Design a binder for this molecule. Structure first.
Ligand SMILES: COc1ccc(C2=NN(C3CCCCCC3)C(=O)[C@@H]3CC=CC[C@H]23)cc1OCCCCOc1ccc(-c2nnn[nH]2)cc1
Ligand SMILES: [Mg+2]
Ligand SMILES: [Zn+2]
Length: 333
């Protein structure tokens, strides 16, 4: 991979983010992106500020310049798609920062694990093309064939890990270059385990494992830590419904458009198009959000908060408030 330039770094470093608190649970990334005509630079500056503010990179021998180079190498591998773009991963990083520090989940993890989770957020969807794992398998695309042949159906998640490893193989963008031995190994393994756990086909089993470990006072400590990391990255990845309504709605619009684009390509290839991906089904945004709330997000957040993560109660409260607001949209239609 080609080295990040001085000029690229400077375009991020000029962004001052006046009037934003990147640590706040009501921080608004959409407003941040509308605040200037260089939203990719503002997004990178948000990630840079979150990581320096944690005080963690400093502790692990990662210089300011190596951090910024890493952020920019991640940025170059995100595509111009409606949802799974650079803004999604910065949002996940910011959201995880709030879970760790506003929700006090940092108390369950080492400082290194906190640092790994914040970094992992930025790599977890590298080179996403706006198509899900199912698309690659149904169309027998080359990447799908490779996944089936090699025995792992998490087509995208393995791909994301490959590209993360590539970025980290150059010292100038290796945020773990200050580590060695077991610490270095833990950093890479925990990052990869977390990325692999973001495949939604593994949602129920990842949640059940975490819950069983949290309930067991004799759970293996290293295993509990690892599952806690996995669960936090998953939480960030389905956190759009835990945000103030207008932010939540803007994420819902972006993800719907990305799904519809997949369905349009699936039609053209003559493969199965699920209702959720079909433009001509006209499905209402409100009903889709209520369904995602009721069947995925509300139970996930309630269960993890009740099991262990009491400081994250606000997520459950905001989901409830958003559900009531979508119900008002239906009531008044
Ligand atoms: C802003 O709103 C979203 C944000 C993210 C998503 C995602 N979605 N998903 C999948 C989508 C297909 C199967 C359902 C599981 C979630 C991803 O993999 C994406 C990649 C990784 C993390 C979550 C992302 C979806 C978002 O809205 C989707 C709204 C449409 C309705 O959704 C429902 C979802 C399940 C039910 C259901 N009923 N019974 N059991 N389950 C009913 C309705
Ligand atoms: Mg993903
Ligand atoms: Zn994601």
């Amino acid at each position: 991979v080609t080295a990040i330039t001085k000029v690229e770094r400077e375009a991020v470093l000029v962004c001052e983010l006046p009037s934003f608190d990147v640590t706040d649970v009501e921080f608004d990334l959409f407003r941040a992106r509308e605040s200037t005509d260089k939203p990719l630079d503002v997004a990178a500056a948000i990630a840079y500020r979150l990581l320096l503010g944690s005080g963690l990179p400093q502790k692990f021998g990662c210089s300011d310049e190596v951090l910024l180079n890493f952020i920019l190498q991640c940025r170059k591998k995100y595509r111009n798609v409606p949802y799974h773009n650079f803004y999604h991963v910065v949002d996940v990083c910011q959201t995880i920062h709030t879970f760790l520090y506003r929700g006090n989940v940092y108390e369950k993890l080492t400082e290194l694990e906190c640092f790994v989770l914040l970094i992992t957020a930025l790599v977890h969807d590298l080179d996403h093309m706006g198509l899900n794992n199912s698309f690659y398998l149904k169309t027998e695309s080359p990447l799908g064939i490779l996944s089936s042949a090699s025995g792992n159906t998490s087509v995208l998640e393995v791909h994301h890990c490959n590209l993360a490893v590539e970025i980290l193989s150059d010292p100038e963008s290796d945020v773990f270059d200050g580590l060695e031995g077991a610490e270095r190994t833990l950093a890479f393994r925990s990052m990869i385990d977390c990325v692999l756990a973001t495949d939604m086909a593994k949602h129920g089993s990842a949640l059940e494992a975490f819950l069983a470990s949290a309930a067991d006072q004799s759970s293996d400590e290293a295993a509990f830590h690892r599952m806690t990391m996995e669960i936090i990255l998953k939480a960030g990845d389905i956190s759009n419904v835990t945000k103030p309504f207008d932010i939540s709605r803007q994420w819902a619009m972006a993800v719907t458009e990305e799904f519809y684009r997949q369905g349009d390509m699936e039609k053209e290839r003559g493969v199965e198009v699920l209702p959720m991906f079909d433009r001509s089904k006209n499905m209402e945004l409100a009903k889709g959000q209520i369904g995602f709330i009721d069947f995925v997000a509300a139970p996930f957040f309630q269960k993890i908060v009740d099991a262990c993560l009491q400081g994250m109660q606000w997520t459950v409260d905001r989901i409830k408030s958003n559900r009531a607001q979508w119900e008002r949209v239906l009531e008044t239609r």
